[PDB]
Amino acid sequence: HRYRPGTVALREIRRYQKSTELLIRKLPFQRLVREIAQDFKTDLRFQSSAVMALQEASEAYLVALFEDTNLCAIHAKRVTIMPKDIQLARRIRGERA
Amino acid sequence: GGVMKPHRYRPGTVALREIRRYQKSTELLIRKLPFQRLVREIAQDFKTDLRFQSSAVMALQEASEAYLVALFEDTNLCAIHAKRVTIMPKDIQLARRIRGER
Amino acid sequence: KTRKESYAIYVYKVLKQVHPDTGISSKAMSIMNSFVNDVFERIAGEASRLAHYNKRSTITSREIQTAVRLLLPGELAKHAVSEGTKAVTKYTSAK
Amino acid sequence: TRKESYAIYVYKVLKQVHPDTGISSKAMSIMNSFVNDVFERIAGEASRLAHYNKRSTITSREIQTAVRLLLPGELAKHAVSEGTKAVTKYTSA
Amino acid sequence: KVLRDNIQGITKPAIRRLARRGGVKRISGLIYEETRGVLKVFLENVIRDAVTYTEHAKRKTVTAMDVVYALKRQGRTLYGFGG
Amino acid sequence: NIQGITKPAIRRLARRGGVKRISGLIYEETRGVLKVFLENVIRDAVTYTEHAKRKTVTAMDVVYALKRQGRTLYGFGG
Amino acid sequence: TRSSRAGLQFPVGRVHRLLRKGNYAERVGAGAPVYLAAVLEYLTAEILELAGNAARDNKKTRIIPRHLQLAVRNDEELNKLLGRVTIAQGGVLPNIQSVLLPK
Amino acid sequence: AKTRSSRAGLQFPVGRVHRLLRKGNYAERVGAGAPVYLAAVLEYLTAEILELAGNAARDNKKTRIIPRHLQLAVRNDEELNKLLGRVTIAQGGVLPNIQSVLLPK
């Protein structure tokens, strides 16, 4: 049949919140990191452990940011996070100007 | 034969006037002596028989007013994001949650 | 082969002291070691800042206690203080 | 007793930049606080770098990289240029 | 002399004035007590830290430097009173 | 390159964050925030590496970079 | 050792050495390494205690990071202490906002 | 010249900086170029801030720089503001700013 819109999302929330495995596949993330790093210095090497630490920190930060964003969107009587929500969150945090 | 009064202001105008007025000056807004009494009480409950340098109280009041002004700024931001114009308690709680305060 | 150090073994002894029939994973071991380093650093730095603030040259047990009372939340700090004072009294008892 | 301050040097700099402009006592205190704060931050960052590199001394390299970690882009760049220039002048003289 | 209910010394007009300096235009009635609570929390934390420093110092009087140290501890550094 | 952070991956992250409904422009905004965050952290990490006179960025350098930013990380020799 | 004399498991001498080499002050008294080691040992005892509890709840024999994250975040005081710390392989606590729940 | 500041052509006291570094337990030993470098950095930051502070005082037709000026200066300059983004200035006040939706139409 069909699941009503908005149900499979709840299942996935239960699913992902119970595990801890990283959610971004490694290789694209690593290539992004190397691209970004290149702009500060040429011919640079990275310990895989360093890349893993970068990914850990980045994903944890993103999850926290989304938590705050969902909180904002709920406050705005909404259920769909929208860019303005992230902007408000970061602004209050003090990260964005 | 009577005495008539000219008119009456629309609401919110003096709010804006006050806003600019207090955004131009810097003088402290909370009255001093109640603040000192409150601080003395709070310290008392942390430990009895403490005395204070006035300058210490002043620094405390400055930090408190600064903190509160920033808090109100963030509250106003939240109020606006909630398509409202009156700040409401839940706005403060949201601000303090996002700030990482408890 | 470089002889790098850690807190592992003592963490394991404590763990046995609280949950005798339990193990721990290597990644959790490293996490624990990082936690110990972090707390050590914070308390030590707070002690040093005390020492500077009071114009004195010695980070003593008293500095450690007051730093513990600055850094840790209420109940955790209370118990920290109790334990530390206890161990110190014992250490001065022996020699 | 002697209560050291950066008051005099701040005055010198001010007159260097604004000869015709005074500073209030409160402003002077604030400036002093800023100076001390920046000093402490840079010094702590440099000490941290020294420790991380298992090194027992602070050289102008540690200070320079500390500045690079602390100040923002243009501010850091000009500060670095000034620091290196002062170091070179001191070494020559 | 005992001190009691000094939190209400933070009168409504004062909180309104602050909110004006914060850019607020229209203030809900319940905002005042919530603001009182927030101020009480913040003051409790800062005074706990400052009193701690004073205790270590073995002083019966709180000095501005104690306040400044406490504030810097809270990641809320203050200029204008030394340090 | 940056786009390699696939939209569904962003969805997965958000789900772990507790989000139920996601907008289109979100994905790109999240990409931007991630790019900035990485930029800061990697900048600091390189700075640390450079002062070490090493061509290989180490984990420890990442750790100090995160600690500077008040985003302390555990599990990599803290 | 000195740990033996103080009823601790944590290496006092290690703490003493680190206190010296970390340039925290010119001179270091005698109690301080003992006290700091005792406090550290107490805290890690607490962390391990709760993490083992969690692992038992999850029916596991060896503590893995997820257990540590659960113990930390679920507890109020530990969570406050680790306010600015992200634990590798830690995840988040299960939590769904009401309005998102089905009606 | 005798003063090390004169050797480095600096207004700040290099000697005082050197003492401070040594009396701060930042490391076992202190190099000779670090006091000079740090003094130069401090001088540069002070000059940069004072420039804007004096300019602000001018804008308010005032001969003396008062805290309000220091605030205005720092908060208007993006980089300085970022350096002091977590700092409070006694008597600083705030930049005049009113949200758009609060303006009458």
Coordinates of all heavy atoms in Angstrom, one line a residue, chain D residues 9 12 89-90 93, chain H residues 1-16 36:
Chain D
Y9 N 51.9 54.9 27.9 CA 52.1 54.5 26.6 C 50.9 54.7 25.7 O 51.0 55.1 24.5 CB 52.6 53.1 26.6 CG 53.5 52.8 27.7 CD1 53.1 52.0 28.8 CD2 54.8 53.2 27.6 CE1 54.0 51.8 29.8 CE2 55.7 53.0 28.7 CZ 55.3 52.2 29.8 OH 56.2 52.0 30.8
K12 N 50.9 58.2 24.8 CA 51.8 58.5 23.7 C 51.2 58.1 22.3 O 51.3 58.9 21.4 CB 53.1 57.8 23.9 CG 54.0 58.3 25.1 CD 55.3 57.6 25.2 CE 56.2 58.2 26.2 NZ 57.5 57.5 26.3
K89 N 63.9 45.3 13.4 CA 64.6 46.5 13.9 C 65.3 46.3 15.2 O 66.4 46.8 15.3 CB 63.5 47.6 14.1 CG 64.0 49.0 14.5 CD 63.3 50.1 13.8 CE 63.4 51.4 14.5 NZ 64.8 51.8 14.7
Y90 N 64.7 45.6 16.1 CA 65.4 45.3 17.4 C 66.7 44.5 17.1 O 67.7 44.7 17.8 CB 64.5 44.5 18.3 CG 65.0 44.2 19.6 CD1 65.0 45.0 20.7 CD2 65.7 42.9 19.8 CE1 65.5 44.7 21.9 CE2 66.2 42.6 21.1 CZ 66.1 43.5 22.1 OH 66.7 43.2 23.3
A93 N 69.4 46.7 15.5 CA 69.9 47.7 16.5 C 70.3 47.0 17.8 O 71.3 46.2 17.8 CB 68.9 48.8 16.8
Chain H
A1 N 70.8 54.3 21.9 CA 69.7 54.4 22.8 C 69.8 53.2 23.8 O 70.4 52.2 23.6 CB 68.4 54.3 22.1
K2 N 69.3 53.5 25.1 CA 69.3 52.5 26.1 C 68.1 51.6 26.1 O 68.2 50.4 26.1 CB 69.5 53.1 27.5 CG 70.6 54.1 27.5 CD 72.0 53.4 27.4 CE 73.1 54.4 27.2 NZ 74.4 53.7 27.4
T3 N 66.9 52.2 26.0 CA 65.6 51.5 26.1 C 65.5 50.5 24.9 O 65.8 50.9 23.8 CB 64.4 52.4 26.1 OG1 64.6 53.4 25.0 CG2 64.4 53.2 27.4
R4 N 65.1 49.3 25.2 CA 64.9 48.3 24.1 C 63.8 48.7 23.2 O 63.8 48.4 22.0 CB 64.6 46.9 24.7 CG 65.7 46.2 25.4 CD 65.4 44.8 25.8 NE 64.7 44.7 27.1 CZ 64.4 43.5 27.6 NH1 64.5 42.4 27.0 NH2 63.8 43.5 28.9
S5 N 62.8 49.5 23.8 CA 61.7 50.0 22.9 C 62.3 50.9 21.9 O 61.8 51.0 20.7 CB 60.7 50.7 23.8 OG 60.2 49.8 24.8
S6 N 63.3 51.8 22.2 CA 63.9 52.6 21.3 C 64.7 51.8 20.2 O 64.7 52.2 19.0 CB 64.9 53.6 22.0 OG 65.3 54.7 21.1
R7 N 65.3 50.7 20.7 CA 66.0 49.9 19.7 C 65.0 49.3 18.7 O 65.3 49.3 17.5 CB 66.7 48.7 20.5 CG 67.8 49.1 21.3 CD 68.3 48.0 22.2 NE 69.5 48.3 22.9 CZ 70.0 47.5 23.9 NH1 69.4 46.4 24.3 NH2 71.1 47.9 24.5
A8 N 63.8 48.9 19.1 CA 62.8 48.4 18.2 C 61.9 49.5 17.8 O 60.9 49.3 17.0 CB 62.0 47.4 19.0
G9 N 62.2 50.8 18.2 CA 61.3 51.9 17.7 C 59.9 51.8 18.1 O 59.0 51.9 17.3
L10 N 59.7 51.4 19.4 CA 58.3 51.2 19.9 C 58.0 52.1 21.1 O 58.9 52.4 21.8 CB 58.2 49.7 20.3 CG 58.4 48.7 19.1 CD1 58.4 47.3 19.6 CD2 57.4 48.9 18.0
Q11 N 56.7 52.4 21.2 CA 56.3 53.2 22.4 C 56.0 52.4 23.6 O 56.1 52.9 24.7 CB 55.1 54.0 22.0 CG 55.2 54.9 20.8 CD 56.3 56.0 21.0 OE1 56.7 56.3 22.1 NE2 56.6 56.7 19.9
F12 N 55.7 51.1 23.5 CA 55.4 50.3 24.7 C 56.6 49.8 25.4 O 57.7 49.8 24.8 CB 54.5 49.2 24.3 CG 53.0 49.5 24.3 CD1 52.5 50.5 23.5 CD2 52.2 48.8 25.1 CE1 51.1 50.8 23.6 CE2 50.8 49.1 25.2 CZ 50.3 50.0 24.4
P13 N 56.5 49.5 26.7 CA 57.7 49.1 27.4 C 58.1 47.6 27.1 O 57.5 46.7 27.7 CB 57.3 49.3 28.9 CG 55.9 49.0 28.8 CD 55.3 49.5 27.5
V14 N 59.1 47.4 26.3 CA 59.5 46.0 26.0 C 60.0 45.4 27.3 O 59.7 44.2 27.5 CB 60.6 46.0 24.9 CG1 60.9 44.6 24.5 CG2 60.1 46.8 23.7
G15 N 60.7 46.1 28.2 CA 61.2 45.5 29.4 C 60.0 45.0 30.3 O 60.1 43.9 30.8
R16 N 59.0 45.8 30.4 CA 57.8 45.4 31.2 C 57.2 44.1 30.6 O 56.8 43.2 31.3 CB 56.8 46.5 31.3 CG 55.6 46.1 32.2 CD 54.7 47.2 32.5 NE 55.2 48.3 33.3 CZ 54.6 49.3 33.8 NH1 53.3 49.5 33.6 NH2 55.2 50.2 34.6
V36 N 59.6 41.9 22.0 CA 59.5 42.9 21.0 C 58.3 42.6 20.1 O 57.5 43.5 19.9 CB 60.8 42.9 20.1 CG1 60.7 44.0 19.1 CG2 62.0 43.1 21.0

